[PDB]
């Protein structure tokens, strides 16, 4: 239906996509043009909405980078589970991670230089490394 | 004496490793405990 | 024309509908094998597979074994085939007990157990039949 | 999953976020830097451990650091 | 007139200003050295023109003039060879008595006692015995004097100067425009009709007028002094009519169509000349004449300026079937817009052609007295085999480079390249299966034979006196080639080569060439060859296909052609680039060619090369121990390496001592390579940090900071030293084993 | 039917005697199946006759290498029995094919379910097969006849 | 001969000790990895960044020194 015109390749997803998380990428193409598949050789993107399926988030983000840096197209990425659940992944709040977005909260932030971590001997026999 | 090696070498080199590998294979992928 | 098209009309799956992969010849040939035939109890599937693979296995040991040149070559080959069949049935039992742990399609504990019992019986039958045939030829 | 940590030496240039192939990193508002932004790793379950973020770091020593740990299907780079 | 000459006058100014600015070509290196890595980069990107300019015209002008420079270097090398033959060689003495006199054209100054390397070759001469077969080549040309060699060297020097001047002129004075380069039809017409057509025609003329009569007189026993000068064979026709009484008729038969009258010196007898042990000169003359005709004909196939001809673009677009979508649509653009694609094809073909040359030259010795020169035959075979392997792997590498850089999916929609990339997984999986099958079966035959021989169960091995694996197909082909003369090649008096079957051609009591029987050992070794070739193809094809992307790195193309890794993520991502695939393919090519050379050497020493008695009895070098000893790994270790390594290890104190020294040095370099191959960069960087602290403590500190070799450079150095050590070890081994004779 | 492959020829549709004029689709399908089976068998038979005539014989049939009809005797009864078994196995496979709903006469490759779209080139190539097969049928029957009547055998001025 | 071989043995011992002592002393950090101690004793690398860091852990020092130990004992 909305999938880009592709002749098929042996590099698509495999059984884990059916049994584990699969990924989908949607975008809008102003015109019809040829882009390189992360798996196969080449595919034609439809005018308007294009929906594509992949087995790894890295493939989706590589294709998104290709679109952004070559055809200046905005894109969205979702994760589909076998149970039917769908989760929105790449634009987490409608703005790319490079751009600052008020409301985000820091995660994994340490308030001291990297060289002030505790020694391994200090954290020993506890299920933790120096960074944690 | 002079009969034991015939009995044991096959057990130690075939039967013992076979059963040992069977049990280890069962336990490695048991998925519980 | 174009004899290569995406499998299942899904361009994004890792497969292709080549003449080898999806043609009447291959679909009908594989769909009638015991491993995939319809309306077969798993015991019957195992029995067919064992019969096929037991008769098949006596020959190499019989003709290329160390006792091939002795007048007892055929019996040694049969015994080697029996031992290998026993090993393979051990493999099948452990695989079934490891894979399907939490009568039907072959992918179940009881289904696979019945398949393995059938395979053992059929493999011993095939080896015995090969011995019987080769004994006088 | 791997553990990604950002230290306060960061100068908020965004290069680590751009280099990330799995969209693990992002920019969050901050006040300890001139740019007013700092890198964060909210979703490290998608981190593969390529350490591209560290390679793309101007600060003397790697304000962003990656410590490899338990391996899952996502972090192991497996399409299967 | 679509095909036309276009040039730019004074394209580049000639000055030395750039010569004092190393790294000027690349934008990154032009800023000067901050660390020692810069230095290495300057020698690594020197000839990477594509990465220095974004314009194809500039890259094309650089390639053309670099090719001119290479031609100048080759001409200088030829000049040096010919000059050392004329002034420092015993060519005349060898001419007089080729069998006994050992060729030599190199002399060593006595400075440290190295004059021992001046062997007692003969002819009142002392020097290093040469194994380049130059003496046989010169004799085939009817040189018969050192004045001619001197003038050959002078002409080569003048040609080298002309090539240098042409390179300078075609870069800095008259640089052809890009449209000039993109003429595949015209270029092919000119290279086929003239370079290869008229080249063959001119060489055939030389042979008919110079080489043929001179060599016929030499075979008759005429001393070189009494042989009239070659120009004397062009002025008085009767002087040639005595040798070939068909010139008397002149050129009138040629134009009248009665070519049969030339059968005197244009023959099709084949076989080998019994006197010199080489191919008949008349056969080679007819060969080159026929090739000249064919090349001239084939050079008119392509359309250049007059309507008639073939347009390769249409030709490729026309070939498309149901299984391949768009067929060969877009390949012409690929091969006329990217030098890497063309270089890949050309290197693959040159390498395969070099290996074919190596195979054909030993089977049918083309030059006089080259067959019995066992040292020359072995050296030429191994040299050209190595060159062929290197060229094949280089073709693979440049195909990968094209895929990474010059591949454009927009222009390659659903054509052959697209489809190959789209079933690359199946291709590689099946190549992997066939490689494993070949390896298992072939090498397990050897392991099984070794195990049975160790257990005393000789009746259970894969040997002639045991379970037999006869190469029935090869034997059948040999029989057909044996029966060809008179039945399928009625006008050919003798078989193409005596390898297939026939008499034993021996010259001066030495077996020049004899039939080679194929047994179970030949079967096993041939399947070993196939296994190694399939594995090398696996590695290189996998590097080419997965050069742009993979299930690990979907965006590998952005990382470039050669990069160390993509980090320790996804498990580990070491050696994931196509350059690393070439790095491994070089090892596997070296292994396969080592096996090929060992097979050739042992088989020829044990089954072909040897001596004959007046009765006709045959005594080979190793007594035919190949059949029952080449079927186990221990047999190769003992009867080939240990047994034939006696010459090298015992060469000390003789003229061959240099070969023993090089044997040890090659072992040393091979072991040294493992230091780079196994270790990683971090250790060495930290060690260099400590050493730099030591230097700094004494106020010695280079401004160019030292750096451990990059990961890619570490691998490259390890591979280069590994190959040098292996090649040198086998070089010394073969040359000392085949010069103690 | 006129649309099915094989028609393209100087003769066009060639049905002098009425066999497909009113035949039901089942009978026309059976006729096409027979035509293709005979044609393919005849192509292989002619190729094998050429192989035997040229002296090309397997290592296991060393003595007989001159006349195919003569060579047929050298094959023991069990050799022919195994030929028959192999042919019957292939016939069983093809019978299993014909049970599938979308079967076309002689399309044991399932072209209907394989091609992206039905094409004229495919029809022309099927016609090429049918024509070379008809020629092979006539040639094979002629070979056997000319060798039975005149015992000299082909390549011996026959 | 004994003299030359003894000096070769001294070379081997000194080089193996150099490798092992460098590994032990730089185990806690180097200029390339000032926080090496945080990554443990045996880790593959620290990525291709800042020049490449293959075989930078102390375990890699032991792995390299094993070759020299074998060579000198040989
Ligand atoms: C570690 C000590 C050791 C080792 C390496 C061997 C090695 C061998 N024994 Mg001996 N043996 C040993 C102790 C040992 N034995 C002791 C203490 C006894 C007294 C019971 C015997 C009595 C014995 C007999 C009677 C025979 C052998 C035989 C053999 C040979 C075939 C192996 C076999 O059939 O085992 C058979 C051995 C047993 C059934 C008893 C087990 C042997 C020891 C105690 C096990 C030690 C395990 C070790 C600690 C490591 C455990 C880890 C492991 C599971 C990976 C082999 C050369 C056979 C022979 O000579 O063939 C030519 C044979 O017929 N052994
Ligand atoms: C191209 C292939 C080739 C090769 C491999 C050789 C090799 C050899 N020749 Mg032959 N030769 C060649 C071509 C070649 N030559 C040609 C074309 C000619 C014709 C002119 C000769 C004429 C010739 C004669 C007449 C003699 C040799 C001799 C020799 C031997 C000693 C050379 C030597 O070290 O002297 C010493 C050479 C040097 C010390 C080199 C000079 C060092 C320069 C100044 C270094 C400059 C580098 C520079 C800094 C780089 C930057 C460029 C700069 C200019 C800007 C050696 C085996 C001699 C021999 O065999 O004696 C028995 C001998 O007598 N050759
Ligand atoms: C480029 C190669 C080449 C060259 C430069 C020559 C040149 C020559 N040939 Mg040779 N020739 C050649 C190839 C060549 N030939 C080949 C391929 C054949 C085999 C058919 C011959 C067979 C041949 C014979 C049989 C004779 C010559 C003769 C001659 C001379 C007289 C030319 C003449 O009258 O023709 C006229 C010029 C044109 C038609 C133009 C001349 C020196 C004659 C000779 O030796 O007398 C001096 C002679 O009798 N040629
Ligand atoms: C017809 C004249 C002729 C003659 C007398 C020779 C003679 C020789 N050739 Mg040459 N050769 C010829 C034509 C000829 N060649 C042509 C036309 C080709 C192109 C395929 C070659 C390719 C060739 C190779 C690749 C090699 C030789 C080698 C040899 C030598 C091997 C010994 C021998 O008995 O050769 C007998 C030669 C043959 C049995 C080859 C005959 C080839 C036939 C004529 C092919 C004809 C192709 C046909 C015209 C295609 C037309 C298509 C077009 C219309 C579209 C000998 C000197 C070998 C050599 O010198 O190694 C040291 C070697 O390796 N030949
Ligand atoms: C027609 C032949 C040909 C041509 C024109 C090129 C041209 C090129 N190649 Mg290709 N290549 C070739 C053959 C060729 N190659 C072959 C046969 C191989 C197989 C080994 C390769 C493998 C190859 C790889 C793997 C790569 C290239 C690359 C390149 C580019 C850069 C080369 C450079 O900077 O040189 C620099 C030259 C040197 C640093 C000199 C080193 C020479 C060797 C290591 C030492 C030689 C030792 C000597 C023979 C004996 C020493 C004796 C001892 C005792 C001292 C350039 C486009 C590189 C690239 O990125 O291109 C895009 C690249 O990555 N090539
Ligand atoms: C002598 C050492 C050696 C051996 C045995 C191998 C073996 C192999 N290499 Mg390796 N390789 C080596 C050195 C070696 N390599 C080195 C030094 C390098 C550095 C350049 C490489 C680089 C390299 C690459 C880059 C590639 C290989 C590949 C292969 C495979 C080729 C396919 C094959 O033959 O499978 C058959 C296996 C064998 C012949 C091994 C011997 C097995 C014998 C016959 C039977 C053993 C007994 C049996 C298992 C008993 C079982 C019971 C027992 C467990 C008790 C195979 C796994 C290729 C590969 O994997 O793809 C196909 C490949 O791509 N190798
Ligand atoms: C109508 C088809 C047909 C029939 C009925 C036969 C029947 C026969 N063939 Mg012929 N043959 C055929 C096709 C046929 N062949 C084809 C297509 C080839 C080319 C590969 C051959 C090549 C061939 C050879 C080389 C020989 C026979 C022989 C024989 C006889 C013994 C069977 C045998 O060895 O088969 C052998 C079959 C094959 C080698 C391959 C069959 C490939 C199938 C068709 C797929 C038997 C009379 C043998 C004989 O008695 O001597 C004349 C013998 O030496 N045949
Ligand atoms: C020379 C190679 C000979 C073997 C070729 C096999 C048939 C090859 C053949 O007939 O191909 C023909 C087939 C038909 O393509 P088309 O005719 O539609 O293509 C028209 C061409 O002009 C290209 O546009 O191409 C493929 O399907 C390629 C992938 C082949 C898949 C099968 C590969 C099997 C490979 C292993 C076989 C090895 C046999 C022994 C080798 C010595
Ligand atoms: C044709 C051919 C082929 C293939 C083939 C095959 C694959 C075969 C197989 C075969 C087989 C695989 C066979 C088998 C058989 C089997 C049998 C025949 C069985 C039998 C059984 C029995 C008889 C049993 C019995 C019994 C039992 C059950 C138990 C016990 C008791 C008794 C004894 C009663 C191909 C096309 C590829 C190629 C060409 C050739
Ligand atoms: C080795 C060398 C050298 C030398 C060389 C030489 C010396 C060569 C020569 C060469 C030559 C000397 C060549 C010639 C050629 C010729 C030709 C190639 C001709 C052709 C002709 C033709 C083709 C013709 C045609 C015609 C005629 C006959 C007339 C009429 C018409 C026509 C036109 C058809 C040197 C020392 C420098 C150095 C190193 C390299
Ligand atoms: C030894 C070694 C080093 C250290 C080696 C260095 C720094 C090379 C030193 C070269 C010297 C300074 C030049 C002089 C060398 C010879 C005396 C002659 C010149 C040889 C060629 C350069 C022409 C690495 O940096 C390295 C990096 C990655 C993997 C393996 C290794 C590795 O094995
Ligand atoms: S690359 Fe380094 S300095 Fe730049 S934003 Fe990321 S952590 Fe901060
Ligand atoms: S060990 Fe070296 S090549 Fe491998 S991932 Fe680490 S830095 Fe890259």
Short mmCIF file of C-alpha atoms in Angstrom, two decimals, chain C:
data_model
loop_
_atom_site.label_atom_id
_atom_site.label_comp_id
_atom_site.label_asym_id
_atom_site.label_seq_id
_atom_site.Cartn_x
_atom_site.Cartn_y
_atom_site.Cartn_z
CA UNK C 1 9.10 -11.12 -17.65
CA UNK C 2 10.10 -11.13 -13.99
CA UNK C 3 10.41 -14.48 -12.21
CA UNK C 4 11.89 -12.98 -9.03
CA UNK C 5 9.39 -11.12 -6.85
CA UNK C 6 9.29 -10.46 -3.10
CA UNK C 7 8.17 -13.40 -0.99
CA UNK C 8 4.54 -13.26 0.17
CA UNK C 9 4.23 -9.95 -1.72
CA UNK C 10 6.16 -8.38 1.18
CA UNK C 11 9.21 -6.49 -0.15
CA UNK C 12 10.70 -5.97 3.33
CA UNK C 13 11.08 -9.62 4.42
CA UNK C 14 14.44 -11.33 4.12
CA UNK C 15 13.40 -13.73 1.37
CA UNK C 16 12.59 -13.92 -2.33
CA UNK C 17 10.06 -15.90 -4.40
CA UNK C 18 12.65 -17.44 -6.75
CA UNK C 19 11.78 -20.51 -8.88
CA UNK C 20 13.68 -22.67 -6.33
CA UNK C 21 11.97 -21.03 -3.29
CA UNK C 22 8.33 -20.72 -4.47
CA UNK C 23 7.37 -22.87 -7.46
CA UNK C 24 4.72 -25.53 -7.88
CA UNK C 25 7.47 -28.14 -8.12
CA UNK C 26 9.07 -27.29 -4.78
CA UNK C 27 5.85 -26.49 -2.94
CA UNK C 28 4.30 -29.81 -3.94
CA UNK C 29 7.48 -31.80 -3.32
CA UNK C 30 8.08 -30.36 0.15
CA UNK C 31 4.39 -30.36 1.05
CA UNK C 32 4.26 -34.14 0.62
CA UNK C 33 7.35 -34.94 2.69
CA UNK C 34 6.54 -36.54 6.06
CA UNK C 35 7.96 -33.53 7.90
CA UNK C 36 5.38 -31.23 6.26
CA UNK C 37 2.61 -33.47 4.89
CA UNK C 38 -0.93 -32.76 6.05
CA UNK C 39 -3.05 -35.14 8.09
CA UNK C 40 -0.18 -37.14 9.62
CA UNK C 41 0.17 -38.02 13.27
CA UNK C 42 3.61 -36.99 14.58
CA UNK C 43 4.31 -40.67 15.24
CA UNK C 44 3.78 -41.39 11.54
CA UNK C 45 6.04 -38.50 10.54
CA UNK C 46 8.78 -39.86 12.78
CA UNK C 47 8.24 -43.37 11.46
CA UNK C 48 8.56 -42.24 7.84
CA UNK C 49 11.68 -40.19 8.56
CA UNK C 50 13.29 -43.06 10.46
CA UNK C 51 12.49 -45.59 7.75
CA UNK C 52 14.02 -43.25 5.17
CA UNK C 53 17.17 -42.57 7.20
CA UNK C 54 17.84 -46.09 8.50
CA UNK C 55 17.89 -47.92 5.19
CA UNK C 56 19.98 -44.99 3.96
CA UNK C 57 22.69 -45.35 6.60
CA UNK C 58 23.78 -49.01 6.53
CA UNK C 59 25.54 -48.66 3.18
CA UNK C 60 28.37 -46.28 4.07
CA UNK C 61 29.46 -48.25 7.14
CA UNK C 62 29.02 -51.56 5.31
CA UNK C 63 31.12 -50.62 2.29
CA UNK C 64 33.69 -48.19 3.74
CA UNK C 65 34.08 -49.42 7.32
CA UNK C 66 37.26 -51.04 8.62
CA UNK C 67 35.67 -54.49 8.24
CA UNK C 68 34.49 -53.82 4.68
CA UNK C 69 36.93 -56.44 3.34
CA UNK C 70 35.96 -59.10 5.90
CA UNK C 71 33.15 -61.60 5.41
CA UNK C 72 31.27 -59.91 8.28
CA UNK C 73 31.26 -56.43 6.71
CA UNK C 74 27.48 -56.17 6.42
CA UNK C 75 26.83 -56.99 10.08
CA UNK C 76 29.43 -54.47 11.26
CA UNK C 77 27.85 -51.83 9.04
CA UNK C 78 24.41 -52.62 10.43
CA UNK C 79 25.68 -52.37 14.01
CA UNK C 80 27.38 -49.05 13.28
CA UNK C 81 24.15 -47.74 11.76
CA UNK C 82 22.24 -48.90 14.84
CA UNK C 83 24.66 -47.13 17.16
CA UNK C 84 24.48 -43.91 15.15
CA UNK C 85 20.68 -44.12 15.14
CA UNK C 86 20.71 -44.49 18.93
CA UNK C 87 22.94 -41.42 19.19
CA UNK C 88 20.59 -39.43 16.96
CA UNK C 89 17.56 -40.47 19.01
CA UNK C 90 19.36 -39.31 22.15
CA UNK C 91 19.98 -36.01 20.37
CA UNK C 92 16.31 -35.77 19.41
CA UNK C 93 15.10 -36.48 22.95
CA UNK C 94 17.38 -33.86 24.51
CA UNK C 95 16.43 -31.32 21.84
CA UNK C 96 12.75 -31.92 22.53
CA UNK C 97 13.21 -31.65 26.29
CA UNK C 98 15.16 -28.39 25.94
CA UNK C 99 13.29 -26.58 23.16
CA UNK C 100 9.56 -27.03 23.77
CA UNK C 101 9.51 -26.91 27.58
CA UNK C 102 7.18 -24.23 28.92
CA UNK C 103 -1.00 -35.37 19.16
CA UNK C 104 -0.65 -31.86 17.72
CA UNK C 105 1.67 -30.04 15.38
CA UNK C 106 5.13 -31.56 15.68
CA UNK C 107 6.39 -28.61 17.78
CA UNK C 108 5.38 -29.77 21.25
CA UNK C 109 6.72 -31.90 24.09
CA UNK C 110 4.30 -34.77 23.45
CA UNK C 111 4.34 -34.26 19.69
CA UNK C 112 8.13 -34.32 19.59
CA UNK C 113 8.27 -37.31 21.95
CA UNK C 114 5.98 -39.28 19.65
CA UNK C 115 8.01 -38.15 16.65
CA UNK C 116 11.21 -39.39 18.31
CA UNK C 117 9.73 -42.76 19.24
CA UNK C 118 8.51 -43.16 15.68
CA UNK C 119 11.90 -42.10 14.37
CA UNK C 120 13.72 -44.69 16.47
CA UNK C 121 11.38 -47.50 15.44
CA UNK C 122 11.53 -46.49 11.78
CA UNK C 123 15.31 -46.11 11.80
CA UNK C 124 15.83 -49.55 13.30
CA UNK C 125 13.37 -50.88 10.74
CA UNK C 126 15.26 -49.25 7.90
CA UNK C 127 18.59 -50.60 9.12
CA UNK C 128 17.14 -54.09 9.52
CA UNK C 129 15.54 -53.96 6.09
CA UNK C 130 18.79 -52.81 4.49
CA UNK C 131 20.58 -55.69 6.21
CA UNK C 132 17.96 -58.18 5.03
CA UNK C 133 18.20 -56.90 1.45
CA UNK C 134 22.04 -56.83 1.33
CA UNK C 135 22.35 -60.22 3.11
CA UNK C 136 21.44 -61.89 -0.22
CA UNK C 137 22.03 -59.74 -3.35
#
